[PDB]
Design a protein around this ligand. Structure first.
Ligand SMILES: *[C@@H](C)[C@@H]1/C(=C/c2[nH]c(/C=C3N=C(/C=C4\NC(=O)C(CC)=C4C)C(C)=C\3CCC(=O)O)c(CCC(=O)O)c2C)NC(=O)[C@@H]1C
Ligand SMILES: *[C@@H](C)[C@@H]1/C(=C/c2[nH]c(/C=C3N=C(/C=C4\NC(=O)C(CC)=C4C)C(C)=C\3CCC(=O)O)c(CCC(=O)O)c2C)NC(=O)[C@@H]1C
Ligand SMILES: *[C@@H](C)[C@@H]1/C(=C/c2[nH]c(/C=C3N=C(/C=C4\NC(=O)C(CC)=C4C)C(C)=C\3CCC(=O)O)c(CCC(=O)O)c2C)NC(=O)[C@@H]1C
Ligand SMILES: *[C@H](C)[C@H]1/C(=C/c2[nH]c(/C=C3N=C(/C=C4\NC(=O)C(CC)=C4C)C(C)=C\3CCC(=O)O)c(CCC(=O)O)c2C)NC(=O)[C@@H]1C
Ligand SMILES: *[C@H](C)[C@H]1/C(=C/c2[nH]c(/C=C3N=C(/C=C4\NC(=O)C(CC)=C4C)C(C)=C\3CCC(=O)O)c(CCC(=O)O)c2C)NC(=O)[C@@H]1C
Ligand SMILES: *[C@H](C)[C@H]1/C(=C/c2[nH]c(/C=C3N=C(/C=C4\NC(=O)C(CC)=C4C)C(C)=C\3CCC(=O)O)c(CCC(=O)O)c2C)NC(=O)[C@@H]1C
Ligand SMILES: *[C@H](C)[C@H]1/C(=C/c2[nH]c(/C=C3N=C(/C=C4\NC(=O)C(CC)=C4C)C(C)=C\3CCC(=O)O)c(CCC(=O)O)c2C)NC(=O)[C@@H]1C
Ligand SMILES: *[C@H](C)[C@H]1/C(=C/c2[nH]c(/C=C3N=C(/C=C4\NC(=O)C(CC)=C4C)C(C)=C\3CCC(=O)O)c(CCC(=O)O)c2C)NC(=O)[C@@H]1C
Ligand SMILES: *[C@H](C)[C@H]1/C(=C/c2[nH]c(/C=C3N=C(/C=C4\NC(=O)C(CC)=C4C)C(C)=C\3CCC(=O)O)c(CCC(=O)O)c2C)NC(=O)[C@@H]1C
Lengths: 172, 162, 162, 172, 162, 172
């Protein structure tokens, strides 16, 4: 896979050029902003269970049809399955948060994800909803001002949102 | 590509689990180490031309026959020299990549993998490169960690040429 | 879905052979057993409403806090109660399915598989259901085989909630 | 897979409804008519070899082109292969006879069967002929009045025919 | 199809290597052996009709019941005889194929594979063929290698019918 | 796979006919011309390394774009890979030289080869160039008059060329 740094090296090698000052400046602000990234992962990761849990409730709350007799989330096997997917997605997102790149999310998680669900009959749109909801939930946690040294997390949250959105856009 | 960060993910993904603390502590070590390394990378990139050229010559001294002997694998001609000037560039360019990535990954993927067959096929000689390399190690005017890191990856390029 | 008949086929199909006598004898046992079982299934289905409701209350007695404590996982409200009334229906509906199929298959596939994660996630408590279940066992007015079969699958639903 | 009973439960679960009296009546006549079903399987199964054998002869008899030099049944490897298919089909049919459902036949036997043959060059139509012939042959045996307690087998034979036909229609 | 040449390739291809000398020496042996064998093949093909017919009868002598007993698997009728005349043709035609290929491959692929099930299914009797075959062995007027090779493949057809 | 002889037997079996005199004459000139075939394989095989090597140089010489930063042969992994393909192709060709048939080349080597490269982005045309060059190179060696008993190799070389061309035409 690729991380923020390996990504830039990739782009340089492809032109057989050394990194430009602007590129060096980018990779050095990432490192500087390091600690903040670590808190995000550690935070999202630590609350994964509740993050998923609540999103599910929200989802079935707006879309009761999924938990009718036969909707796709009907029955514990299928319901269990949906819960697993929300976690699989989440887990990959955190991987992306730490890498500073979405390659790992795109490659191991999002690709062909749209076809898979289609074949199964599973409604992508809804999955996207469940993602859009974990997003708000996860960003509330990561960016919570309590218990953390004050500072600007905007850049990062924006990026974290990028990833989630990227995912919802890959299954809707 | 293998980097401290990606290895950590690779591990977590293998066992289907979220990221541990141990793993997180690992990335932090990489970020901490990333300072003097980005510095080495920046330095070397700014000295790119002189190290290449200074390296080019140094390999025409230890191995004079390359400058005389006819045959496409020899610098005995312009296009020959062009090729070698290109290769040290590639070698130099690779070290800084490893520096920016915090690992030998870049070098492994782009140069190391397949190195033998390619040297063996085009009748290229490792000596020539371990030479150009040995000159780079003692001509980068780096000190402290910047030199520590830099040198580490250089030696790696040598053992890989053994 | 796992049923006496399908297990028999599954076995024969695994070894690529036609069906044996032993297998055939097995289906016959299932047909013989199917009488008192279809009876249990019919009975319970006809008493569906009273067993559900009678079950609903019995779980608001052994566990009063569910009727008071606020929080979506509690019957403390209408929609809460609606949900629980729905779940015992599902539990009841499942036993009769097993009865009609001559096995725990229905229950295994539709309820048992994933039961834990789901109870654990929505903060649902097994106690509540083993309770509603324990009331069904002593309130189905079944006797002879009809009750034997019925009870068997009920206990299964309990161990599965342990 | 699904058997006659699991099939009905499937349809109920999908509406989250208990079985209707009419459904209970259906599953109870199946059980009552049990013994007859058992004789069919036991009978067809016991004569599988001769059932297949004769159908083959009939087939090559009406269609000599299949056993020319190169027709598809030419050569012992290919001929052997055809014989195996007739048995595979038959074997699945009996499975269906016993289940009171064709799920096992449709899923493990008939699906993609049409493509498979096409790729191979094997003429579906002919396979269908070989099936249509095992059908008559198998129904003569199952429904033979000798050595069996008198009674009406019509319903069942009709069903058994259903399955065979279902198969021939899945490869022609 | 299995032939001395193809086995050699199969071996080399399995280990992903070019062809050895040992392998090459093998094909040469096959070419050397190919002379008297192409001769046996040519001979037998030119005597095709008499060997078939002479073979047909010889099987109606050792096994008279085949000419009388009613039933499609018997030569008791024309179409019956037609079939048997066809089969010895197939058997004869197969030996020459093995002769041309320098191996039992042809016979293995086109006849041997599936022989049992097919004899067992159509109620065909090996005896009939080992018979027709035994007549071919002593009626091909072959000598030296041509007969050596020829006979080898014939016996193979017999053991395969055992 | 098929060799020159098995190929002819294949064609006869398909008509259930014995070989014709003309067919016997063909298979007997092959055997007679045997030794020459052996020298070709032994020769091409023995010089495989230099054969491949030189073709590569030639190729990158006419097409420098492949060894730019990112061209497809850029980087030792990719370059190594190209070298391997040239050898894989060559190796299969020699197999064909010895068989007197291209079945082994077509089946294990050339089929789907065009798609494979396309997916990868690898330019077929160029691969075809690298093949066309190994061809001239290999035919110079095989047909070299030095160190070999004088005689007409034309037929064979023509065949050997056939194979190579067949390959270049299967990826261009
Ligand atoms: C967003 C998160 C917002 C915010 C953050 C903010 N955090 C820090 C500093 C630190 N965070 C850590 C935590 C870790 N470092 C690690 O290597 C690991 C993995 C083992 C973890 C969990 C650390 C060590 C620091 C630095 C020491 C410190 O506490 O200062 C800072 C500051 C500086 C910086 O970036 O380093 C800030 C500004 N505060 C908010 O309200 C945000 C929502
Ligand atoms: C169609 C088959 C026609 C027909 C049948 C007919 N059969 C029976 C009864 C029985 N058949 C069996 C055989 C088995 N039972 C098994 O469990 C197994 C597997 C080990 C087998 C092989 C049995 C035990 C009976 C019942 C006892 C008896 O012989 O009566 C009946 C009758 C009743 C019923 O359905 O039970 C009938 C009417 N007769 C024909 O001519 C048909 C062609
Ligand atoms: C093309 C190759 C041209 C040419 C050839 C030519 N070669 C021969 C004869 C022989 N070659 C061999 C070599 C082998 N035989 C093997 O079985 C093996 C594998 C172990 C090898 C390597 C042999 C034994 C002979 C025959 C003995 C001899 O040297 O004569 C001949 C002649 C006859 C024939 O075909 O047999 C010719 C005419 N000469 C050229 O200039 C060509 C380019
Ligand atoms: C009743 C005995 C007690 C009670 C129940 C209660 N359950 C839920 C929510 C859910 N229950 C299930 C269970 C199933 N769904 C199935 O499809 C099947 C198989 C047919 C089973 C067994 C599920 C999936 C949910 C959540 C999804 C949903 O809301 O439908 C709740 C609600 C929890 C919430 O937060 O909204 C409640 C209250 N509660 C009690 O106090 C009773 C003692
Ligand atoms: C939840 C938000 C919704 C839902 C989900 C649901 N998903 C499946 C089944 C599968 N999901 C995947 C996806 C992945 N597998 C992976 O390995 C990865 C990367 C690590 C991904 C993204 C796959 C492969 C399956 C099928 C395999 C399997 O069943 O395990 C189901 C089950 C469908 C079924 O019938 O079996 C369900 C229900 N369903 C919903 O209703 C929600 C809206
Ligand atoms: C002859 C020695 C005796 C004899 C033969 C007889 N054979 C058959 C039928 C079949 N024989 C084969 C055999 C082959 N088919 C092949 O393609 C090959 C490889 C080239 C072989 C060896 C097959 C497949 C059949 C059945 C299919 C068909 O009819 O073609 C019969 C007819 C049996 C029937 O019931 O119709 C007979 C009579 N019978 C004798 O009495 C001779 C002593
Ligand atoms: C006989 C009626 C006709 C005939 C048949 C024939 N079939 C094949 C090859 C295959 N058939 C299948 C089918 C199945 N495989 C399965 O596992 C199942 C479910 C249990 C089915 C339905 C498959 C997969 C093959 C190919 C694999 C194989 O060869 O084993 C052949 C062989 C074709 C070949 O060239 O190899 C033949 C000849 N042929 C006829 O002429 C009859 C009309
Ligand atoms: C320089 C120290 C000496 C020298 C070099 C020389 N090299 C070549 C040819 C090649 N070198 C490579 C190496 C790489 N290609 C890569 O993409 C990478 C990773 C970025 C590496 C390390 C390759 C692939 C070739 C051949 C392909 C090509 O020509 O580009 C030559 C030319 C050989 C020829 O026959 O044309 C030479 C001369 N020669 C010296 O005398 C110096 C001491
Ligand atoms: C060289 C002339 C050009 C070139 C080649 C190149 N090829 C690949 C990758 C693959 N090639 C194959 C082909 C085969 N595999 C086989 O097993 C066989 C039969 C024995 C054949 C014909 C396959 C399967 C691959 C992919 C698998 C792999 O990478 O090993 C590459 C690599 C592409 C990549 O990104 O990984 C390259 C570079 N490239 C050129 O520029 C030349 C013009």
């Amino acid at each position: 896979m690729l991380d923020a740094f390996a990504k830039v090296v990739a782009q340089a090698d492809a032109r057989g050029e050394f990194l430009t000052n602007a590129q060096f400046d980018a990779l050095s602000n990432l490192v500087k902003e390091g600690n903040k990234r670590l808190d995000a992962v550690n935070r999202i990761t630590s609350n994964a269970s509740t993050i998923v849990a609540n999103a599910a409730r929200a989802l079935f709350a707006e879309q009761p049809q999924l938990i009718q007799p036969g909707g796709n989330a009907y029955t514990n096997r299928r319901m269990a399955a949906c819960l697993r997917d929300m976690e699989i997605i989440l887990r990959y997102v955190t991987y992306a948060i730490l890498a500073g790149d979405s390659s790992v999310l795109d490659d191991r998680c999002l690709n062909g994800l749209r076809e898979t669900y289609q074949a199964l009959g599973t409604p992508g749109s809804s999955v996207a909803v469940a993602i859009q909801k974990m997003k708000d939930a996860a960003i509330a946690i990561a960016n919570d001002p309590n218990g953390i040294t004050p500072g600007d997390c905007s850049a990062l949250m924006s990026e974290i949102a990028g990833y989630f959105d990227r995912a919802a856009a890959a299954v809707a | 590509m293998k980097t401290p960060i990606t290895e950590a993910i690779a591990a977590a993904d293998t066992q289907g689990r979220f990221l541990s603390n141990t793993e997180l502590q690992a990335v932090d070590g990489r970020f901490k180490r990333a300072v003097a390394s980005m510095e080495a990378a920046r330095a070397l990139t700014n000295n790119a031309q002189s190290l290449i050229d200074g390296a080019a010559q140094a390999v025409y001294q230890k191995f004079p026959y390359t400058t005389t002997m006819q045959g496409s694998q020899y610098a005995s001609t312009p296009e020959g020299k062009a090729k070698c000037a290109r290769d040290i560039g590639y070698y130099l360019r690779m070290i800084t990549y490893c520096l920016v990535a915090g690992g030998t990954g870049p070098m492994d993927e782009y140069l190391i993998a397949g190195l033998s067959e390619i040297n063996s096929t085009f009748d290229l000689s490792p000596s020539w490169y371990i030479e150009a390399l040995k000159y780079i190690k003692a001509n980068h005017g780096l000190t402290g960690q910047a030199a520590v890191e830099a040198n580490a990856y250089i030696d790696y390029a040598i053992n890989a040429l053994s």
